[PDB]
Design a protein around this ligand. Sequence first.
Ligand SMILES: O=C(Nc1cc(-c2ccccc2)nn1-c1ccccc1)c1ccc([N+](=O)[O-])cc1
Ligand SMILES: *[C@@H]1O[C@H](CO)[C@@H](O)[C@H](O)[C@H]1NC(C)=O
Ligand SMILES: *[C@@H]1O[C@H](CO)[C@@H](O)[C@H](O)[C@H]1NC(C)=O
Ligand SMILES: N[C@@H](Cn1oc(=O)[nH]c1=O)C(=O)O
Ligand SMILES: N[C@@H](Cn1oc(=O)[nH]c1=O)C(=O)O
Lengths: 762, 762
Amino acid sequence: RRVVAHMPGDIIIGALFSVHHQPTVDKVHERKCGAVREQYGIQRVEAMLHTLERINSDPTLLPNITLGCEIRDSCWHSAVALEQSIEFIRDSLKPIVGVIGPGSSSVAIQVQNLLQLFNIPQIAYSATSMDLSDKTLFKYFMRVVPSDAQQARAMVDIVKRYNWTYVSAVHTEGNYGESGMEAFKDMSAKEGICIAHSYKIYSNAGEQSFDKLLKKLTSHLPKARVVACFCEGMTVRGLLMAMRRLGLAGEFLLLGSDGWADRYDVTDGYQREAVGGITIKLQSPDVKWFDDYYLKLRPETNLRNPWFQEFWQHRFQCRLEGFPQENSKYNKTCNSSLTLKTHHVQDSKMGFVINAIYSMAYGLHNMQMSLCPGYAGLCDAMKPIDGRKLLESLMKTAFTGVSGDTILFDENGDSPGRYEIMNFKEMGKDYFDYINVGSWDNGELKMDDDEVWSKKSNIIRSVCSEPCEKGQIKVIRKGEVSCCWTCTPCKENEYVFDEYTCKACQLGSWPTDDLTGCDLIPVQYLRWGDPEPIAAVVFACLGLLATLFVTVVFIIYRDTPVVKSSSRELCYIILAGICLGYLCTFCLIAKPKQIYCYLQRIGIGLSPAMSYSALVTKTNRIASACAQLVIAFILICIQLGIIVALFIMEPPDIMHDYPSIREVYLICNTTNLGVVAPLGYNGLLILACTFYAFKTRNVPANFNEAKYIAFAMYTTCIIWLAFVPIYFGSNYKAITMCFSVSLSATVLLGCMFVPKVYIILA
Amino acid sequence: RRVVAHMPGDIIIGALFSVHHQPTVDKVHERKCGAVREQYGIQRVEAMLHTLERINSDPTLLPNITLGCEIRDSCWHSAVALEQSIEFIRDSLKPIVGVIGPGSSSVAIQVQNLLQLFNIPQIAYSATSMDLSDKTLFKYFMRVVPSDAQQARAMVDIVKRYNWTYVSAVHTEGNYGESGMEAFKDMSAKEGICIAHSYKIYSNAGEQSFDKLLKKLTSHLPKARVVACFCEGMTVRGLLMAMRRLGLAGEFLLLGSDGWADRYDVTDGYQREAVGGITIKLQSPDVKWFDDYYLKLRPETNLRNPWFQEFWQHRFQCRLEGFPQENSKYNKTCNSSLTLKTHHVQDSKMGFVINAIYSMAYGLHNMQMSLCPGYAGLCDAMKPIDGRKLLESLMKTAFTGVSGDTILFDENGDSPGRYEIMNFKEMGKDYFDYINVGSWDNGELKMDDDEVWSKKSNIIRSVCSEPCEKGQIKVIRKGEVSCCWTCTPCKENEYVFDEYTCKACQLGSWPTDDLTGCDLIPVQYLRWGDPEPIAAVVFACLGLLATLFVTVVFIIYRDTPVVKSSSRELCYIILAGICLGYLCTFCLIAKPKQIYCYLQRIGIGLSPAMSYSALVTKTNRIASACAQLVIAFILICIQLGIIVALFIMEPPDIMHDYPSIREVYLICNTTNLGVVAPLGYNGLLILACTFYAFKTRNVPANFNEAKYIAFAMYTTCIIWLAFVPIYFGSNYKAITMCFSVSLSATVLLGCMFVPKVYIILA
Ligand SMILES: O=C(Nc1cc(-c2ccccc2)nn1-c1ccccc1)c1ccc([N+](=O)[O-])cc1
Ligand SMILES: *[C@@H]1O[C@H](CO)[C@@H](O)[C@H](O)[C@H]1NC(C)=O
Ligand SMILES: *[C@@H]1O[C@H](CO)[C@@H](O)[C@H](O)[C@H]1NC(C)=O
Ligand SMILES: N[C@@H](Cn1oc(=O)[nH]c1=O)C(=O)O
Ligand SMILES: N[C@@H](Cn1oc(=O)[nH]c1=O)C(=O)O
């Protein structure tokens, strides 16, 4: 059947080493595992077979007693290792104190499920899965290697450090790859990372299965250029084989895991397809004394290792004619000159196997010391070794590993460990070698980006969408994933509220530079320096000059008999009204203020009433005594009363009008009704003036001035009728107001004031 | 050691029935399972014993050979079942020829991983997970129940049938619940479903874990009203207990699975919490002969079943004083009047257990018939029973099961089956019972939508966001599952093109009522039917009538002595200028086209030159068949040359101008130059000719017309200076041009022709 190593002794420690390769996908039911392995097989077998002798020669460990082993073979298969463990326990149905757990995590789970039935403590050296840390189900399981939650954290840190966002994930079926990828998915998709799609594949699947997997991987080729591989060594070897077969020169950047580590048997003959890969390897410096013992081994003298002969044939293809394992398949015959020195690699996880066996030895030594402190041997109270006591002792056995540091088992039976971020690279032509470019110990990732990517043209950033943080362009995501977005800009009215939202601020406002925030529009008023305002104010100035000139001339010629027909105050109140009109034009052009707008309203109400009440008195009186001032002031006072009514109704306040979202101006609260009320008032005044104008328009005067009053009436009537479209049609509004009122003030002067003075001076 | 229920026979068939409960959390390491179970325990053990007795009593099935059994207790735990299986195969280290596998999928997997190493076919009556369908790892595993892929499909179909989207998910940790929820997640998020969060919990977890899980479930309570539970029975019982404790009486609609089924253990004493829950049960009719056998059992006689005394005491709390297993913990004593009839409920999976036993018996019978057809009974070639031959025989056996149908296994070792959609409801007063509301069969889901929710008010559909495609409101996804969209509308300018992008009508289009497709807003014309157009046309018509009357008067009085100072033609030329100006006014408002705006522009350009040139010529002459005609002609030639040069530089066409995106107007070709070149030319003319008219003032003429002319041309200059900013300021152009040109021509309709009509009239 399956041969087994032997080493008789007082206490027997079983072991489970993957001596042969996993059974091929066809021979699974026969459980006929395949070709031999050096590193995971013979090297570990000889490591145990020599560390037991190193312990035995040591009197400080297990004095006066002999430690023995029964090394079995697990073929990296749960089904095979279960049956080998059954062979372990058949004696309990020499007893076995414990085993050194199998390398595979799923195999370790399968073995533990049976070992805990017989209180047989199991120590593992590579079973890195998290699921084994649950002491409720796996009480008798311990390991000198940290869980792979730390490994998932390390990979998340790696992809963080390289801007990688849209990665792809492959993991082998089982419990190591499955739980590792679950943890990585958690701590990545939580923070910022994005897995394009998660894939699974058995290690021993056929070539076509890897072909299909690589087709699915190349489906996302342009963007997901990074593959996060929680994959055992053989899975990555299969992936490289598929990469070669279907013609890929290494478009991807494989991101390996503890399975890949820095093994040379996963990238032998397929180096060109793996250049640039980044792997994670547990730090374990090579054990010197094992190398010095192993390199001298020869197939003739080594007889306690039944798998050494077939391995020796397999390594140097040859035939051992003088030994029973002929294996005539190899044509040639090897001389007594082939040595293991040439192309010798000691695996990474050798310090772990040695440390695990040393942990078992120290647990047994502490048990012996505690149970029988006096007796320096096999005390009669410890001959039936109780499993539970040994496990309890093992849980707290701190010692010094062959590496040099101290080995402790925490509450979950793990042990602290660092990491060494390897990086496959092509140092020389036809020459590739794993190179160390980093570290990771308790959340810290030190990794120089110079040995890796000795340039700035690194791998294409595995990013779904390029950043678009340039002003208006935001990001939107339809239904695919939170990582791929189609950038779109929103209107200039709005600014980016967040990454995924841009909202416009209120009517009077504007987004800031680069749309970072929003700012109020700088409001502007009717500027003092501008062609139309300057023209208006100069017009007001010249009109004022003329008006006070007329008042002065009137005052100096106060009692001239020809003008002793109308009231002296009448052609003084008309001057006053024209003066308030000019003051209204002057005060219209200004920053709109409460007092200022009140001034505008009161002037617009009062000035037209003042001057034209004189006309009303004239046309009525020509048709008595001196009460014409009274009959004008009654109309003026009712005008003041109504204007106070609207003024109380519409108190003066300033609002920033919004003709458009771009522009804002500041005005006061004169509304359409509030401006049409005095406009209608003046229209009624003009209607009454016309209703009294006919006879005055026809009856001449001494200086035929009634005719000039008539044309002044017609001109002011037409300028008043045509005014409405200019003010309402145009958005300037204030300019129309000032120009119209100023012109209406001028026209009455130009027909009556000049002729009287002109004749008087002549 | 645990007790077993032996039975004589040359062929021995093992069994694993969960007689006792799962070991408690604090007692796992000691593997001491809890209380006894009736339905999943003693009922199944009695079923197996009686059915083996029936087979041994049947001569047509396995003649001349007696079937035995070695029933063992699995306590529903993986660890206990493993030591039971090791005890099964202890002889192989009378051999067992095949076990009737345990119920739980994880337990079945753990037992199978050990049994298949010894070629022992295992038939499971209730293992349902999809992992067991893989024949590369589970070669020696068959079942008489369909996998849970169909169950996940039925769950998804049920969820789809009630528009549940934002459902919550909980699954018992293990291999049944875990794989079930994996299938559900995959092939529900495939079609349309959503998952708020997926939780997991061991079925034996303490009250604290259940309390935390229920709090986490309430964390989505407002929207996640449906809980998808791929949960074992005890997990649902724990959830119901938690709901009872932390006051949740009817805030969830549990969607159970086969684990819940129609069990009364899960909802015993907790009916009020579980009302309305929907569970999926594997259809299996009751077996009446089993009921007849079982209801007659008494602890006095039943000595071949070691657990019957403990179960009898636990069912009717008592102590059997006449038996070794008194267990005086219970106070009272069992009188000889208690019978199993009262409250007896057969377990749902009773057809499947008997079917599994019959399947193993029929496989053994087929293998015996094939091995030794001549011999009727045991043969020498069969005495070392080979597991491979038995498995081959079982894989292709067909027989009539107790339900009356035919039992067969496919290439994966499963067996077809159909489900029933049970629903828990309050039948009456404090009387709760599992009711049947439909079945599922190979994608065919049938229900009774009136039996469950006998009203239009069903459960609040677990929807994260209400339908947001209302009118114009958009759909936007946030940083979570694309399931809870936020309702935002986009402006009336744009329309909802896609639920995640609503694009805008480009410049002159409008969205329809559905906001799916821009409507290309129709343009508006000059609005011939409107009061302002009516006034314009009436004014133009009256001016035309007056001009034609004046022309008729002139033609009749061709050479009257009064009109002799003025040139005969010259007055006719200004008449022509006026009537063509009125014609251009009348045509100014219509639908712009090459047949209209052509003559529009030529008329407006040419009118102000011909009339005004004739007028200035009249002034010059007063200042016969001479240079007057040629100077008017050359002035017209140069003005028309300017017009034609403009037309060459601005061909006639209509542009649909866009003052705002809201509205669109149409206007024929027009530029600033096209409206200022005639403006500038004519303005130079008015300046020069107004200087001329002021020079004329009052001079002897034909009845002193010079004063009339000077006054009218003063009005002409003032109106020309007046409304130019009106056109430059106001938005309206056509109507204002109409009115202005019409009344400005009216100004020159009087001065030339009021004296003529007055002279004729007088
Ligand atoms: O209505 C006349 N033509 C005209 C056109 C325009 C104009 C203004 C702004 C933009 C574009 C075009 N303005 N405008 C005008 C001319 C004079 C007075 C008022 C308006 C007119 C009236 C009388 C005589 N005539 O008596 O010779 C000549 C011409
Ligand atoms: C990308 O990562 C590198 C670190 O090597 C650094 O430039 C920075 O953290 C990231 N750059 C951007 C633009 O995110
Ligand atoms: C579920 O939605 C469909 C359409 O989505 C509708 O016809 C039906 O009335 C809704 N309700 C039920 C109970 O099916
Ligand atoms: N670390 C893996 C085992 N393993 O697989 C390999 O290919 N190398 C290796 O160490 C596990 O934890 O299961
Ligand atoms: N399909 C279930 C079967 N089952 O689970 C229970 O808890 N009861 C029961 O019948 C499983 O795989 O365990």
